[model samples]
Target chain A: MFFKEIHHVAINASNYQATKNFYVEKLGFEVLRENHRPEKNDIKLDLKLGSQELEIFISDQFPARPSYPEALGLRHLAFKVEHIEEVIAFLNEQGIETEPLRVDDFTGKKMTFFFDPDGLPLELHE
Target chain B: MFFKEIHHVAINASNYQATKNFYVEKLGFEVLRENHRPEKNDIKLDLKLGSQELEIFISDQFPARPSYPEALGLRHLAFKVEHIEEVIAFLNEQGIETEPLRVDDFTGKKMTFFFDPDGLPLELHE
Candidate 1:
C-alpha cells in the first residue's frame, strides 16, 4: 500500500490563533509549528498529538473552500471515545451538541456526532 | 483525555453499493456487515480494516445534510503515505486530479489531495 494509514487531517479556520487556542486548550493538542504564508495570504498552524498532527489554516476572510458530502474526497473524522458518557458530558459543558447515540449492530459499539465551531461533523465512537 | 485515538470514519454515500465497490475494490477495505434501518429510511454498510470499521449510510435522497468547510464540525481525512510518487501515480491512474504539491514546513513532508467521487478532499501525505 502506498498510503499506510492516516497521518493527519486539516481544517480551515477563520482565525488561526483562536483555532489554535481551541485545539490546544480544549483538545490539548500541542502546537507544533505556525507558518505564515504571505503568498497564500494565510497562516497555518500545525497542531500535534504524539506522531499525528492536525493542520489548520486561517485566511483574511477569503472565500471558503468547497466541501459537499456526496461529492468526493476526504470526509468526516471519527474519533475513538474512551467513556462515551463522560465525553458527551464534557462536550456538552463546552457547548457542543451531539446526535442521539447510535449502536453498531455489528461491533456493539455506540457512537454519536457533534459539529465543531465551523459545523464540521465529527464522530465520537466507542 | 476523553478520546484514545481514531478508530474509523463514516461517510454518507448516495449509493451504498457503489461506494462499497470503490472502497473495497479500489481502496481495499473489507466488508463487515450491512444493516437496514427502516425507521430511518436508510441502509448502513459496515466496512472493516483490521480492527477498525468505516460506515457508509445510504438514504432515500433526503434533503442533503449541509456541510460547509467553514462550519464548526468534523473536517477532512488525511491518509499516510509510504512513498509519495507511487501513491500519487496510483491516485492519478484512478482518474483523480490533485492540487499542486505542498510541503510541510515543520516535518518536510510532501502531500497532495484528490477528491473522492463524491468530492471529499482526501490527502495522500508522506
Candidate 2:
C-alpha cells in the first residue's frame, strides 16, 4: 500500500456548540485541537477518534446535506463497539436516540444508527 | 471511549465500473466481498482499507453531490503517507490528478487532495 491507515475523516457542521457537545461530550472523543479561522469564518475542531482523527469544521454557511435519495459521495461512518446494546443504552442516557437495532444482512452483526447534531448518520456495529 | 474504532466508512458512487476501478485498481484497496442487491437495485462493494472497511454502494439513481458551497456532513477521507511526493507521482502516473501540495497550518505536514471518480475529495497527508 502506498499510504498507511486513515489519518482523519473530515466533516462539516452547522452549529458549533451543539456539534462540539455531541461529539466531545456525548460520544467521548477527546478534543485534540481547536482553532477559529477568521478568514474562513469557521472553527476547525480536531478530535481524537482512537488512533485516527475526526476533523470537524463548524460553520452555519454550508447548506444541509440532501437525504432520502442521498447525494452521491461519502455517506455515513460506522464505529465498532463491543456491545451494541450497552452503547445504545449509554447513548440513550445521553439523550441520543438510535434507530431500532438491526442485523447486517451480510455479516449478521448487530447494528444501529444515530445522528449528529447536524443529522449526519453515525452508526454503531458489534 | 465506548467504541473501539471506526468500523467502516461508506460511500455512494454513481458509476459501478469507474468507482470499482478507482478504489480497487487505482487506489489499491482489496475487495473483501461484493453483492448485487436486487431489492435495492444497487451493488454493495466492501473494500479493505487497512484495518477498516470502505463500503461503497453503486447506483445510478443517486444525484450528484452539491459543491462550491458544499453541503454539510461528511466532507473528505484522508490517508497518512510517509512520502507525499512519491505518492503524488504514482497517482499522476495512474492518471489521477492531485491538487497543488500544501502544508497543514497547524501540523505543518505536507498534504494535498485528489478526487475520486465521482469527485469525492480524498486527501494524502504526511
Candidate 3:
C-alpha cells in the first residue's frame, strides 16, 4: 500500500489554553511542541497520542463548524479502548460528559461520542 | 493514557460512489461493510485502512464546510508514508494532483497535500 497509516490530524481550537488543557490534561496527550505564530495570530500545538500526532491550531479566524445539519468533511476521531465502561467512567470523573453507549450495528462493538472543548466529536470504540 | 490507539475516523462524503471509489479503488482500502439507510438519507461505508477503519457517510443534507479561513473542528487527515516521492507519483499517475512537497519545519520530514473529490484536504507525510 502506498499509504502506511495516518500520522496526524489537525484541528482548530477557539481557546488556546482551554483546548490545550482538554487534550493534554483531560485526554493525557503529551505536548510534543508548542509554536506561537504571531503573524498568523495563532498557536500551534503538536501533541502525542500514543504513536500518533495531533496538531491543534488555536486561532480566532476559524469559523464555527456547522453541526446542526452537520458539515461535509472530516467528522470525528474514535480511539480504540479495551474497556468502554471504564474509559467512560474516567472521562465522566474528569467532568467530560459522554453520549449514551451504543453498539455498532455491523460490528457489535461498544461505542459512544464525546465532545472536545470546541464541541468537536470524539468517540471511544471497544 | 486511557486511549490506546485511534480505531477509526469518520467523514461526511458528498458523493457516495465517488467517495467509495476514492478510498477503495484508488487508495486500496477494503470495504468492511456498507449500509444504506433511507430514513436518514445516508449510505454508510466502513472501510479498512491498514489496521484502522474509516467510516464514510454519504449524505446530501450536510452543509458545505466553510474552508476559506477554515473551520474550528477536525481538519485535514494525514497518512504516513515512507517514500513521499513514489506515493506522489502514483497519485499523479492516477490523475490526483498534489501540492508541492514541503518539509515539516519541526521534524524536517517531507510532506504534501492532496484533495479528495469534494476538495477535502488529505496529507501525505514522510
Candidate 4:
C-alpha cells in the first residue's frame, strides 16, 4: 500500500456551538484539541473517534452544501455499530432525527442515516 | 460510545473509469465489489483501504462540489504515511500532482495534499 491508513476526515460547519454539541456531546466524540484561528476567522475542533480523528472547521463564511442533486465529491460517512436499533434510539433521545432503517442492498446490513448540524449525512451500519 | 468505528467514507465522481483507476490503480485500494444500479443509473465501487471501506458512486448526475469558500459539510480526507517523500514521488510517477510539502502547524508532521480525479483533496501526513 502507498499509504499507511486514513489519518482523519474533516468537516466544515457554519455554527460553532451547535456543531460542537452535536459531535462532542451527542455523538460522544472526545475533543482532542480546539483552536480559534483569528486570521482565518474560524474555529478548528479536532475530535477523536475510535482510532481516527474528525477535524471540524467552523466558520460563518462557508455556504450551505449543495444537495437535492448533491455535488460531486466526498459524500456521506458511515460508522459501524454493534446495535443499530439502540444507536437510533439514543440519537432520537438526543433530539436527532434519523432516516428509516433499511438493509444495505449488497451486504444486507441494517443501516440508517442522520444529519449533522450542517445537514451532512452521517450513517450507522450494523 | 454509540459506534464501533468508521465503516466507510463515500465519494461521488462523474467518471467510473477514471475514479476506479485513480483509487484502485494509483492509490492502491483493493476492490471489494462493483455493482451497476440500472435504476439509479450509477455504478457503485466498494474499495478497501486498510481496515475501512471507501465507497464510490459514479454517475454523470452529480455537479461539481463547491469550493473557494468551500460549502459546509464533509471536507477532505487525509491518510497517514510513513515516508511522505516516497509517496509523493510515487504519485508523481503515476501522473498525480502533489502540493509542496509542509509541516502541520499543530503536530509538526510533514504533510501535503493531492487531488483525486474529481479534484477532491486527499492529504498525506507523516
lDDT of 2 by residue, A26-123 (tens): 88888999999999889999999578699999998999988978999899999999989999999999999999999999999999999998899999
Which residue pairs collide, candidate 4?
A: none
What are the per-residue Cα lDDT tens digits for candidate 1 across A56-86? 8776553343354242333467788777888
Against the correct fold, how does model 3 do in TM-score? 0.96
Model 1 per-residue lDDT at B114: 77
The full ranking of all candidates by lDDT, starting with the best, is: 2, 4, 3, 1
lDDT of 2 at A54: 94
B49-89 per-residue lDDT for model 1 (tens digits): 66556777766453333354233333467888777877777
Write the residue-wise lDDT of candidate 2 on B1-126 in tens digits. Answer: 785489999999998899877998888888999999999889999999567689999999889988988889999999999999999999999999999999999999999999998899999999
Name the candidate, 3 or 4, with the larger lDDT value.
Answer: 4
Estimate, for each residue in B62-107, the C-alpha lDDT of model 3 and write its tens digit: 8886677889999889988998999999999888999999999778
Per-candidate TM-score against the hidden true structure = 0.76, 0.97, 0.96, 0.97
What is each candidate's DockQ, to 2 decimals? Answer: 0.37, 0.81, 0.81, 0.81
User: TM-score per model for chain B alone?
Assistant: 0.81, 0.95, 0.94, 0.95
Mind giving the per-residue lDDT tens digits that candidate 4 earns over B57-100? 99999999899889999899999889999999999999999999
Question: Once model 3 is optimally superposed onto the true structure by TM-score, how far is the C-alpha of residue B17 displaced, in angstroms?
Answer: 2.1
Chain A TM value for model 2: 0.96
The CA lDDT at B110 in model 3 is 99
Residue A27's lDDT within candidate 4 is: 90
Q: What lDDT score belongs to each candidate, Candidate 1 first? A: 0.68, 0.91, 0.88, 0.91
